[PDB]
Structures are given as structure tokens and as C-alpha cells.
Design a protein around this ligand. Structure first.
Ligand SMILES: [Ca+2]
Length: 223
């Protein structure tokens, strides 16, 4: 997260870190056994880490649970990043509490102008590299489809939306991939892509979760 703030320990209780020897992506806990992340975060050997703040220190509220299976969206295209969504099932159910909690799926799509919370452990610089160890947060509005398409001609599908600031300076970044965009207590987006980070006229692009609720519910119900 570039141009954000330190969230505060366990203030984003649905935020997970995906770990394969090291943090490589974020995710969102949507019930006791399932995490939603980006399809481009797919790999084998995933451990889901819940209750994290400093991802380099065991602080006492963590739960570490290995994934039993990952399910990439059947229509995911890794070239265009269309349908950039994946489900991860935990080998055992997480113990839900005030610091480890699921986030609700949307009942309706969120509109341009809606304020959302984006979070993650990704790079905090737009040029160069600095990875925080504590969770970072950014409040950002959803942008209009027209401004999104104008920023990224030929690249924005009906399964994507832009959020952030056209002036630059505030954005998600590398390492935030797969993490949540939450608006009015609903998971509306997944950190997907962008051209660099926090660059003028290149806002963050996010997977439009409301298009996938039926797929998510049906997949969970049979897996
Ligand atoms: Ca920790």
C-alpha cells in the first residue's frame, strides 16, 4: 500500500496473508474454512495465516492453517487478468473471534464514488521498494467505469473496476495482490493489477466480486 496508514493490529480481521515460506499475497476470509484471493496468486504449498499484524513476528493472535485445495476461476485468463479470482479451502476451520472474522459477500455491486478500505503488506513506495511488516490500510473511492476505461484503454472488462486517485500517490501495490477491497462492510474487490503503483492516471484495478457471488456460493457448497 502506497500513501496509506498503519491499520492497527487486528483491526482488519478478515485480512489473511498467504505464505509459502514467505508472504506472497493477501486474501479475505469469507467463512471459517474458505478464503477468496486473486487467481494470479495461485501456487502450490499455501499456508493461510490469519490474525496477523506484523507478519515477521508471532504476536499471539495468529492461526496458521495449510490449504487443502485451491480453485481458480474456470474462466481466468492470465494474460488479460479477466476473472482474476480464486478460492482457497483451509485444512481445518479457523476459530472465529473479534480478531479473526469473516467478511460478508456483496448482495449488490458497489457504485462509483463508494468509499472502500484496501489493505495489505505490499510495497509502500511507488519508486523503489520497501515492504512493511505491519498491515497497511488505504481509504479510496471506486472510480467511474468511464474514467477507468479512459485510464486503461482496451484493458477493462465487465469483471473489473478501478479504485483510488487519478492524481496518484495513493494505491495498492506489489504484495497487496489478492487482498480485500471492502465497502460498507462487504467484500467488493480483490487487489488485481495496475500500471506501476500510485502513478498519475493509473489507478488500481480490482476484481469485481459481486459478479462472482453465485460461483463462490455454489463452489463452497460442493467442495
Ligand atoms: Ca505475526
Amino acid at each position: 500500500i502506497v500513501g496509506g496508514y498503519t491499520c492497527g493490529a487486528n483491526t482488519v480481521p478478515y485480512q489473511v496473508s498467504l505464505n509459502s515460506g514467505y508472504h506472497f499475497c493477501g486474501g479475505s476470509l469469507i467463512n471459517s474454512q474458505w478464503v477468496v484471493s486473486a487467481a494470479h496468486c495461485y501456487k502450490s504449498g499455501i499456508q493461510v495465516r490469519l490474525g496477523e499484524d506484523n507478519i515477521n513476528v508471532v504476536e499471539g493472535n495468529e492461526q496458521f492453517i495449510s490449504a487443502s485445495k485451491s480453485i481458480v476461476h474456470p474462466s481466468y485468463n492470465s494474460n488479460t487478468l479477466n476473472n482474476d479470482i480464486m478460492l482457497i479451502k483451509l485444512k481445518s476451520a479457523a476459530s472465529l473471534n473479534s480478531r479473526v472474522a469473516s467478511i460478508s459477500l456483496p448482495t449488490s455491486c458497489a457504485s462509483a464514488g463508494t468509499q472502500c478500505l484496501i489493505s495489505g503488506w505490499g510495497n509502500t513506495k511507488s519508486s523503489g521498494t520497501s515492504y512493511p511488516d505491519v498491515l497497511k490500510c488505504l481509504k479510496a473511492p471506486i472510480l467511474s467505469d468511464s474514467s477507468c476505461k479512459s485510464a486503461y484503454p482496451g484493458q477493462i472488462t465487465s469483471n473489473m473496476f478501478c479504485a483510488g486517485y487519478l492524481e496518484g500517490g495513493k494505491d495498492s501495490c506489489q504484495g497487496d495482490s489478492g487482498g480485500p477491497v471492502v465497502c460498507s462492510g462487504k467484500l467488493q474487490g480483490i487487489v488485481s493489477w495496475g500500471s506501476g503503483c500510485a502513478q498519475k492516471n493509473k489507478p488500481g484495478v480490482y476484481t469485481k466480486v459481486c459478479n462472482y457471488v453465485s460461483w463462490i456460493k455454489q463452489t463452497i457448497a460442493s467442495n
